[PDB]
RNA sequence: GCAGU
């Protein structure tokens, strides 16, 4: 949630989605922690999703 | 099952079962807490509809 | 004449002089999106209107407001091509200048405390390229236009579909643009009923009582009163005469004069004429005349305060004698004349239970939200928010226009919400239609049906995003921190960006572009679609919306439509068709003032097309303009008939006005059946571009328009002279007349070389001009795919013979000679990207490496030291393209291979070969390799090599365009310097860098020198500004998906030659699969030994009556026959006078043709270039429905010394003996369609199986398995094939222990099965048991 | 009353 | 969704 809020404010101030290597410096967490957090936050697709 | 792109892919049955178990454990909670009848009636209705 | 179209002139057999040139064919998409994004001062279109629709956003209380100043579109981060390479959307950032106005706490009028304005960023909106396509996640997408029902009111009926009694039931329906539907209808007993959102029906007067009308007001609105001023004489009755129209008078009428009609007679209009001519208005009626009459007013007794008769109550004699005691002189009564007037409203008010506003609102609430207890201020807000709130209902400008036009109001403009009188007028027109005083609307009339295009759908989705933002801003302005926040702390860009993003990427109308040839694109952009959000569903669309209405004439093609489940739901905009300012298709017509058909053009829509009489385009007329015939065939109301010359109002503007740009390319369309024309128009869009484009010898003249209006070609923006031509670029030195002051005056055109289309074909631009030759504005400079000198060339002119050949052309098969495969005619290049994605697994990273375990050393021969293939490497199926390994663990090998490891000692590796290999059957050249590396991952030697190549190429291209432009600027400087104070023999020694500071005497041209020097300096500055940006875009990281480390994309370029199985076609619906590639010596051949290229079947002509494919052949014999003469004159090296004479005879031929090619003005060099371009057959133009008559084809055959019957005697190639009858031999324009047998053939023995059910996987991409479905099981049950069936069920799909045993038995030489229970049945028993049901197996 | 007119448990809760 | 039979 903190990551989504911070990336929301960064997108609002610089007009683009922030890279994890600047999202990690607006926060104070290591960049690989931001990478694993971004890898975690996804919800599973339903297998009944039509292609 | 994990898709190769790191994301997962589930069946809708896991979502429906997970809803059932959430409402059921909450009903057991409310029955232990001696909640008012409005709340336990609403929870029984939600478990029935889940 | 031209310069690009006198290289080779297509002889035109058209006879009607064209009055309107074909418009820009992609103006639908481009005009719509331009209206979307461009700035609107008056706020009517696009983004400005969507902002003013929502802003200003006031708070819930009114202490603060968020208003909108203006918006802006940022610069896109990446170019179109960079977005296609990096797989990102080509969009522009929406920078909106907002303003937060905050007041003091208690202000008199809302006097402000502070204003804080700043430029918030809300979302990115995808931009449309200059060809009407959108690059969305790298793929080019086309948002197809939608044909939906126009907002308004529509009166319709069911024609006795209910109650089995033949009673037509009428219904009015108010459809808003955005809002809730409102229906009125008649039930089988004439009670008016209302529905909202198609839920269960209320009586219609409940909504009249929801409005504040009482019962007497309702009866006053929907009726006219008959008044009984009961004088001394029994029921002295006031009367207007016409009320007596058509009824059986059982009472006599006596009033100071004649007894007019005896009792027991029906009376006619002459009796009413009698009663109104003798001027009787007040009569004497019998006492029982009130028995049955319904009172109109609420009659009260002022003596006792009690209402002695309620309104809408049937007066009777006892009730009449009752209220007559109260001393009431006038009795008002609803006048209901049957078959002219209806009891419908009164008999409806007799049904509803509500008698005042609150009870009606409560009934509407119980209808709308059932089971929720209604309160007063909840129901009276639900109803006011249904139709009468400007934020929850919109009858838009087109909706208000159609609404007022239906009810015959005078205004075309009004409010977007309903009103009392709107609903009253809809009910009134429905009652009028019930009384026979009107007619129901036609729901699929193209004036009741309108075009919603990309720039309106995108604005709708953007407004959806803005209201999702407005709710959050209203939730935010209701807080107490309003003195510290800026407006960008309130705007989440993700609602807007998500709405626009899902519309552009994942809508039904935003479709993956069909990019086979230029025609596929140019007819996918002109597509109309009844489906989509807010449209039909292809499964629930009846036979009538799928029909060709009489109003598609000139607006929608009748021919070009799909053939599958959605036919007539996907339409194609006709050639001249346009859209209204409201979105109604309009088509152009020439006004016929006094019989002189004026060249003035008026665009008539479908509703105003029926008021006029409109002559055909085939109607003959002299140079004066008058119709030379006297009964002109015209279209009056949707029906066709003959009219006098004086009646005719308008005339068609062309003969191809009715057909689309795909069907206007079919030559001799007037001789094909409409089914075969549909098939041909659909199969032209599937032809793949061959190696060398070949123009059609028989065309229709729309080739140039289709090839130019699609952006596949390079068209000169300004005229000039070709300074430099090259396979990769064309540099044009612009003429002095066309260049601006302070400009280099040089146009560079960079050509697209060998890139992938959406359909994996090659799109590749070849320069058409030569070095030094002059070009004009609009001249085609470089061809595209399927383009020959600026014409649209979708195939090749194959010499066909119509004869049956030994059964090898049986049932629409094609026999092809080997000289079509030799000459590489239908060889097509196909480019495939293949991606090797090195991901980060949880056991460790996968690495792109060249030391692959347990693979040969010869397999890694084509990989470089970095594990990736070389560019130029000829690969076949199975070869490793990108060497990759995934780390694996927990081997746990069986004891036997454990012993095997113990004996030989080859220890297994920790990595698994997951490399990217060429798919089986594919064989081609690697032509490009792209490596995208995640930032932080160190680049391998190949990525750094590709980057130094990219940086060298970017720097070299920018330096070369700077050298070109600066050379042009210095040539312009030298031209200005010699215009006065000429140093031409001094300036040639002075170096080019010294000419700027050379002060010339300032008459006026020193201003020119100032502007040219300033242009040169800012060119030098812009070169560096572009080079540093190119360098930082090259050397920057890639925003890959989370989890992947790098992606290597290998671009194979396969050359598919023609082979048995490949689907070939013509333009007349004559498809066919090649059945044999016959040797040259086996083909039939004429008396001169020329063999036949393709042998088609005569039996495919007469039943499917595409006679055009015969005439195209007979004329293609004529065209090439001209060429074979010019070629002969080019081999004897005849003088140019004889060539000029013969080419003038070939261009003069025809019966009053509209073109005049006068070679008297051609220079001899231009005649020679033309004759060199005509030595392969003279291209002929047969426009659609005014093309070449058969007599002209025979005259052209006589000119080329050919048999005028179009038939020669052939000889068998194998036996040398003559075929007993003359054979139709000629030149048909054949097309190789994209259904290639290489992409069709697929087989599996075993492979991957599905996960839940253990059956094989789906298709040839997942290695397939063919569905042995239900009808095939019935086929095996109809035979006694019990074992074949059983092995199709058990040991080929699902018996998991049984299919491995079957494999080991087939391998061990024993064709025997041991079938068990299919695993799908165990899945079924487990899924039935997960319901509360106990299903078992008994024994 | 409104008993038996709805199937939504949200509406029954609010009722 | 878009095509092919
Ligand atoms: C200014 C212009 C001519 C006057 C009027 C007449 C028809 C109106 C459009 C249609 O109503 C469809 C659509 C409705 C949405 O609600 C708002 C956008 C759309 C595109 C409207 C915009 C504008 O209002 C139009 C173009
Ligand atoms: C004929 C023409 C005007 C005289 C001269 C002036 C500028 C010259 C081009 C530039 O130098 C860039 C580039 C250099 C390569 O080396 C060869 C190709 C390019 C396109 C040149 C071609 C040709 O030489 C040009 C057009």
């Amino acid at each position: 949630n903190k990551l989504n809020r911070i990336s929301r404010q960064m997108l609002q101030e610089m007009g683009r989605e922030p890279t994890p290597e600047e999202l990690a410096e607006r926060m104070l967490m290591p960049e690989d922690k931001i990478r694993k957090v971004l890898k975690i936050a996804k919800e599973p697709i339903s297998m009944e999703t039509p292609i | 099952v994990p898709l190769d792109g790191g994301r997962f892919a589930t069946s809708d049955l896991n979502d429906l079962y997970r809803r059932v178990i959430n409402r059921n454990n909450r009903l057991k909670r409310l029955l232990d807490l001696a909640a008012p009848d409005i709340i336990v009636r609403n929870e029984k209705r939600m478990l029935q509809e889940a | 004449y031209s310069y690009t179209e006198k290289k080779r002139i297509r002889k035109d057999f058209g006879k009607r002089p064209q009055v309107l040139d074909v418009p820009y064919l992609l103006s639908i998409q481009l005009d719509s999106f331009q209206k979307f994004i461009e700035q609107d001062p008056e706020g009517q279109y696009g983004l400005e209107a969507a902002f003013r629709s929502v802003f200003p956003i006031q708070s819930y209380s009114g202490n603060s407001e968020l208003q909108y100043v203006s918006y802006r579109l940022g610069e896109p981060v990446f170019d179109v091509q960079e977005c296609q390479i990096r797989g990102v959307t080509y969009s522009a950032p929406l920078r909106v200048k907002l303003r937060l106005v905050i007041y003091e706490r208690e202000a008199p009028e809302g006097t402000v405390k502070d204003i804080k304005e700043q430029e918030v960023y809300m979302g990115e909106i995808p931009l449309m390229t200059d060809n009407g396509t959108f690059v969305i996640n790298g793929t080019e997408r086309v948002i197809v236009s939608q044909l939906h029902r126009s907002p308004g009111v529509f009166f319709d009926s069911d024609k006795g579909k209910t109650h089995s009694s033949g009673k037509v039931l009428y219904n009015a329906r108010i459809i808003p643009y955005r809002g809730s539907w409102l229906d009125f209808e008649f039930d089988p007993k004439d009670n008016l009923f209302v529905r909202i959102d198609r839920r269960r029906k209320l009586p219609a007067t409940i909504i009249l009582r929801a409005l504040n009308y009482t019962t007497e007001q309702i009866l006053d609105l929907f009726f006219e009163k008959v008044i009984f001023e009961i004088r001394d004489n029994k029921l002295q009755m006031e009367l207007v005469p016409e009320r007596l129209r058509g009824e059986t008078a059982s009472f006599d009428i006596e009033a100071n004069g004649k007894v007019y009609v005896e009792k027991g007679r029906r009376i006619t209009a002459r009796h009413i004429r009698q009663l109104e001519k003798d001027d009787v208005k007040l009569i004497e009626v019998p006492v029982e005349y009130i028995a049955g009459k319904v009172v109109a007013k609420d009659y009260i007794d002022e003596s006792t305060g009690e209402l002695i008769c309620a309104a809408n109550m049937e007066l009777s004699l006892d009730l009449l004698a009752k209220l007559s005691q109260s001393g009431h002189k006038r009795i008002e009564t609803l006048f209901t004349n049957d078959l002219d007037h209806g009891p419908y409203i009164s008999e409806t008010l007799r049904v509803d239970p509500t008698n005042d506003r609150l009870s009606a609102l409560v009934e509407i609430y119980r209808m709308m939200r059932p089971g929720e207890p209604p309160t007063r201020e909840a129901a009276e807000s639900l109803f006011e928010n249904l139709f009468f709130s400007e934020d929850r209902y919109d009858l838009s400008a087109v909706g208000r226009m159609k609404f007022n036009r239906s009810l015959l109001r005078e205004e075309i403009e009004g409010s977007g919400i309903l009103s009392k009188d709107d609903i009253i007028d809809v009910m009134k027109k429905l009652i009028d239609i019930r009384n026979g005083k009107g007619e129901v609307d036609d729901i699929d009339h193209l004036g009741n049906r309108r075009i919603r295009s990309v720039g309106e759908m995108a604005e709708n989705q953007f407004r959806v995003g803005l209201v999702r933002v407005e709710r959050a801003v209203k939730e935010r302005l209701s807080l107490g921190d309003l003195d510290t926040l800026m407006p960008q702390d309130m705007i989440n860009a993700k609602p807007i960006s998500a709405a626009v993003k899902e519309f552009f990427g994942s809508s039904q109308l935003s479709q993956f572009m069909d990019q086979n040839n230029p025609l596929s694109e140019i007819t996918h952009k002109r597509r109309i679609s009844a489906l989509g959000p807010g449209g039909l569903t292809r499964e629930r669309a009846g036979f009538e919306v799928r029909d060709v209405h009489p109003t598609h004439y000139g607006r929608v093609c009748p021919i070009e439509t799909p053939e599958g489940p959605n036919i007539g739901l996907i339409n194609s905009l006709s050639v001249y068709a346009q859209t209204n300012e409201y979105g109604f298709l309009e088509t152009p017509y020439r006004k016929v003032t006094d019989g002189v058909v004026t060249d003035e053009i008026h665009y008539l829509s479908a509703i105003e097309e029926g008021n006029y009489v409109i002559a055909q385009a085939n109607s003959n007329l002299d140079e004066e303009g008058h119709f030379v015939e006297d009964l002109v065939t015209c279209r009056s109301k949707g029906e066709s008939s003959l009219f006098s010359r004086d009646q005719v109002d308008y005339m068609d503007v062309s003969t191809q006005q009715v057909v689309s740009v795909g069907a206007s390319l079919i030559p001799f369309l007037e001789h094909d059946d409409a089914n075969r024309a549909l098939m041909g128009a659909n199969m032209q869009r599937q032809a793949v571009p061959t190696l060398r484009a070949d123009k059609p010898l028989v065309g229709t003249g729309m080739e140039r328009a289709v090839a130019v209006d699609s952006g596949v070609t390079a068209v000169a923006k300004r005229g000039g002279v070709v300074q430099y031509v090259d396979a990769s670029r064309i540099v044009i030195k612009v003429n002095e007349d066309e260049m601006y002051p302070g400009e280099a005056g040089i146009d560079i055109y960079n050509l697209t070389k060998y890139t992938r289309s959406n359909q994996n074909t090659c799109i590749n631009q070849m320069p058409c001009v030569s070095l030094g030759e002059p070009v004009e504005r609009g001249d085609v400079l470089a061809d595209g795919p399927s383009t020959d000198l600026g014409e649209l060339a979708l195939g090749q002119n194959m010499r066909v013979a119509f004869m049956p050949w030994n059964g090898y052309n049986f049932e629409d098969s094609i026999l092809v000679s080997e000289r079509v495969v030799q000459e590489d005619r239908f060889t097509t290049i196909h480019i495939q990207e293949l991606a090797c994605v090195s991901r980060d697994t949880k056991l460790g990273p996968e690495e792109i490496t060249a030391d692959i375990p347990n693979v040969g050393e010869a397999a890694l021969s084509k990989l470089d030291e970095s594990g990736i293939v070389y560019i130029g490497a000829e690969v076949t199926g199975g070869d490793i393209l990108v060497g990759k390994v995934t780390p694996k663990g927990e081997t746990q090998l069986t004891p036997e291979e454990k012993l095997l490891r113990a004996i030989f000692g080859e220890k297994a590796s920790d990595v698994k070969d997951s490399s990217l290999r060429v798919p089986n059957g594919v064989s081609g050249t690697v032509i490009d390799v792209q490596v995208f590396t995640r930032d932080g991952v160190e680049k391998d030697k190949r990525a750094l090599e590709i980057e130094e190549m990219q940086l060298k190429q970017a720097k070299k291209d920018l330096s070369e365009e700077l050298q070109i432009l600066e050379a042009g600027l210095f040539s312009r400087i030298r031209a200005v310097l010699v215009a006065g104070g000429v140093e031409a023999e001094k300036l040639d020694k002075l170096p080019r860098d010294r000419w700027l500071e050379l002060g010339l005497t300032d008459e006026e041209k020193q201003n020119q020198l100032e502007q040219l020097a300033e242009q040169y300096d800012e060119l030098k500055h812009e070169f560096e500004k572009k080079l540093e940006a190119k360098r930082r875009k090259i050397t920057q990281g890639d925003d890959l998906a989370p989890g992947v480390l790098k992606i290597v994309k290998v671009y194979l370029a396969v050359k598919r030659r023609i082979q048995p199985g490949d689907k070939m076609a013509g333009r007349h619906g004559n498809k066919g699969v090649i059945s044999k590639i016959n040797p040259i010596e086996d083909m039939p051949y004429d008396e001169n030994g020329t063999p036949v290229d393709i042998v088609l079947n005569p039996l495919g002509v007469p039943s499917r009556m595409n006679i055009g494919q015969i005439l195209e052949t007979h004329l293609g014999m004529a065209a090439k026959g001209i060429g074979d003469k010019i070629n002969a004159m080019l081999k004897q090296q005849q003088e140019v006078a004889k060539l000029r004479e013969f080419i003038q005879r070939a261009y003069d031929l025809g019966a009053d043709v509209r073109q005049k090619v006068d070679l008297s003005t051609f220079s001899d060099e231009e005649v020679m270039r033309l004759a060199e371009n005509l030595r392969k057959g003279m291209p002929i133009a047969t426009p659609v429905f005014d093309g070449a008559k058969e007599a002209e084809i025979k005259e052209l055959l006589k000119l080329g010394d050919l048999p005028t019957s179009g038939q020669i005697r052939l000889y068998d190639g194998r036996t040398g003996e003559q075929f007993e009858r003359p054979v139709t031999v000629g030149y048909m324009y054949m097309l190789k369609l994209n259904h290639l047998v290489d992409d069709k053939m697929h087989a599996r023995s075993t492979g991957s199986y599905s996960l839940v059910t253990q059956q094989p996987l789906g298709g040839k991409a997942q290695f397939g398995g063919q569905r042995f479905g239900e009808m095939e099981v019935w086929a095996l049950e109809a035979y006694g094939a019990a074992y074949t069936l059983q092995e199709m069920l058990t040991v080929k799909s699902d018996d998991v222990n049984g299919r491995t045993k079957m494999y080991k038995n087939i391998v061990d030489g024993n064709h025997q099965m041991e079938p068990g229970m299919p695993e799908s049945f165990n899945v079924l028993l487990k899924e039935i048991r997960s319901l509360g049901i106990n299903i078992e197996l008994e024994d | 009353s409104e008993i038996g007119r709805t199937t939504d448990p949200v509406r029954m809760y609010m009722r």
Side-chain angles (χ1 to χ4, degrees), chain C residues 758-1017:
Chain C
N758 280 3
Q759 277 75 48
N760 282 326
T761 48
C762 179
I763 56 185
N764 167 53
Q765 294 189 308
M766 288 176 36
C768 194
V769 292
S770 55
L771 181 78
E773 81 166 44
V775 302
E776 267 163 334
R777 181 158 195 278
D779 272 17
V780 164
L781 284 189
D783 286 330
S786 282
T787 288
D788 194 1
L789 256 64
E791 296 185 25
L792 181 82
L794 303 177
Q796 314 273 329
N797 299 288
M798 316 296 318
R799 186 183 161 111
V800 305
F802 280 90
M803 57 168 303
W805 200 84
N806 284 110
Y808 275 106
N809 53 7
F810 178 78
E811 278 271 16
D812 291 331
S813 291
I814 296 173
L815 183 72
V816 176
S817 68
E818 199 183 4
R819 214 195 280 288
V820 191
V821 198
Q822 286 200 4
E823 293 178 355
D824 265 358
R825 314 225 48 196
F826 301 103
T827 292
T828 63
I829 307 159
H830 298 254
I831 308 194
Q832 321 174 359
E833 86 184 7
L834 308 167
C836 180
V837 190
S838 174
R839 308 208 147 81
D840 209 324
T841 47
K842 61 183 180 292
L843 281 83
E846 326 178 1
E847 66 175 1
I848 308 291
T849 186
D851 47 358
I852 287 167
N854 76 6
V855 79
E857 209 286 331
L860 321 169
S861 66
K862 302 193 185 78
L863 312 183
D864 71 340
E865 73 275 339
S866 195
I868 316 183
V869 71
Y870 286 112
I871 280 173
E874 291 285 326
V875 291
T876 59
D879 294 29
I880 303 171
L881 292 178
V882 188
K884 200 179 64 160
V885 288
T886 63
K888 63 160 170 44
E890 292 90 6
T891 56
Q892 204 59 255
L893 62 80
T894 175
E896 294 95 24
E897 54 195 80
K898 196 166 166 46
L899 166 67
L900 190 71
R901 297 322 173 123
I903 299 182
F904 302 142
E906 273 69 13
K907 295 182 289 294
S909 68
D910 46 347
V911 287
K912 187 181 63 83
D913 172 71
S914 191
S915 64
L916 171 68
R917 303 170 194 268
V918 192
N920 293 113
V922 177
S923 175
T925 286
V926 174
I927 64 171
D928 197 13
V929 171
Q930 289 170 348
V931 186
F932 313 98
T933 301
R934 166 175 316 285
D935 194 339
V937 175
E938 60 98 16
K939 302 193 190 138
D940 44 354
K941 289 176 48 187
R942 178 84 163 193
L944 301 176
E945 154 179 348
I946 292 164
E947 279 195 354
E948 78 180 1
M949 278 173 29
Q950 282 196 276
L951 285 164
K952 284 193 61 164
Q953 187 60 41
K955 177 182 173 189
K956 168 179 170 192
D957 287 330
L958 262 67
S959 178
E960 273 169 7
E961 72 91 20
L962 190 79
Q963 286 164 230
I964 286 163
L965 266 66
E966 86 194 8
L969 260 176
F970 278 139
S971 171
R972 210 169 170 199
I973 278 175
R974 181 172 181 86
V976 175
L977 259 58
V978 304
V982 53
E983 302 93 1
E985 282 81 4
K986 185 247 183 182
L987 212 60
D988 48 349
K989 322 288 157 83
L990 187 71
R992 54 193 307 187
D993 58 355
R994 300 288 187 179
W995 296 359
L996 278 73
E997 78 269 34
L998 188 147
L1000 193 69
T1001 178
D1002 51 354
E1003 317 93 346
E1004 181 61 29
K1005 295 167 310 158
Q1006 198 54 48
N1007 194 0
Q1008 292 185 17
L1009 271 184
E1010 288 288 328
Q1011 208 161 5
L1012 264 67
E1014 166 210 320
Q1015 178 53 242
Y1016 181 44
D1017 287 331

Side-chain angles (χ1 to χ4, degrees), chain A residues 42-48, chain B residues 1 3 7-12:
Chain A
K42 278 69 174 185
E43 187 73 352
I45 309 168
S46 73
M47 281 166 56
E48 287 87 20
Chain B
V1 284
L3 299 176
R7 213 171 175 191
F8 274 86
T10 192
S11 184
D12 297 0

Side-chain angles (χ1 to χ4, degrees), chain C residues 366 369-374, chain D residues 2 5-7 11-12 15:
Chain C
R366 298 193 207 282
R369 304 199 188 114
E372 164 177 339
Chain D
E2 301 295 323
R5 304 203 188 269
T6 184
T7 48
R11 283 214 189 98
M12 309 187 214
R15 209 168 53 199

Side-chain angles (χ1 to χ4, degrees), chain C residues 673-699:
Chain C
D673 200 290
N675 300 313
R676 286 298 148 177
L678 184 146
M679 296 182 199
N682 284 334
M683 285 183 325
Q684 267 169 312
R685 328 181 298 104
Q686 296 162 5
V688 285
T690 58
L691 291 177
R692 281 176 154 154
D694 199 20
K695 75 194 161 323
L697 286 194
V698 193

